[PDB]
Amino acid sequence: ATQGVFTLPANTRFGVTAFANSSGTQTVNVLVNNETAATFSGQSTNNAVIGTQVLNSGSSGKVQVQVSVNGRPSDLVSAQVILTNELNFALVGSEDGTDNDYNDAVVVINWPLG
Ligand SMILES: *C(=O)C[C@@H]1O[C@@H](C)[C@@H](O)[C@@H](O)[C@@H]1O
Ligand SMILES: [Ca+2]
Numbered sequence: 165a166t167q168g169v170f171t172l173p174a175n176t177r178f179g180v181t182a183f184a185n186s187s188g189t190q191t192v193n194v195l196v197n198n199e200t201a202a203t204f205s206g207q208s209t210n211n212a213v214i215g216t217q218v219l220n221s222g223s224s225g226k227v228q229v230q231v232s233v234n235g236r237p238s239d240l241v242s243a244q245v246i247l248t249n250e251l252n253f254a255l256v257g258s259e260d261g262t263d264n265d266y267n268d269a270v271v272v273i274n275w276p277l278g
C-alpha cells in the first residue's frame with residue numbers, strides 16, 4: 165500500500181519535522197498538492213533534527229513525504245493518529261538499508277497549530 169501520503173483538512177497550517185538515525189545522509193522532501201514545499205538534508209546517528217517547517221495544506225490538503233539517501237528512495241512506513249478527536253499526528257519511518265530499524269529518517273507532521 166501507499167505510504168507517506170496524508171489528506172489534511174484544506175488550507176490548514178501544519179508542522180513537519182525530520183530526524184535522522186543513519187550513517188547515510190538523509191534527504192526528506194515534503195510535497196503539498198504534488199509540489200515540493202520543503203526539503204531537509206542532514207546526517208545523524210543520534211536523532212538530530214535535520215529540519216522543521218510550518219506549511220499550509222493548500223486547496224487539496226494532499227501532503228506527501230519522500231525520503232532518499234544519496235538518491236536511493238527509502239522504504240516508507242506511515243500512519244495517522246488522532247488524540248481526543250482533535251490533535252493529529254502523521255508519522256513516517258524509513259529504511260535505507262537492510263537492518264530494518266525504519267528510523268533512518270523519521271518525519272512527524274502535526275496539526276492544528278496555533
Ligand atoms: C549503513 O551503514 C546503514 C545505516 O546506518 C547505520 C548506522 C544504522 O542506522 C542503520 O539502521 C542504517 O540503515
Ligand atoms: Ca536502517
Ligand SMILES: [Ca+2]
Nearest residue numbers: 185186267268
Ligand atoms: Ca538507523
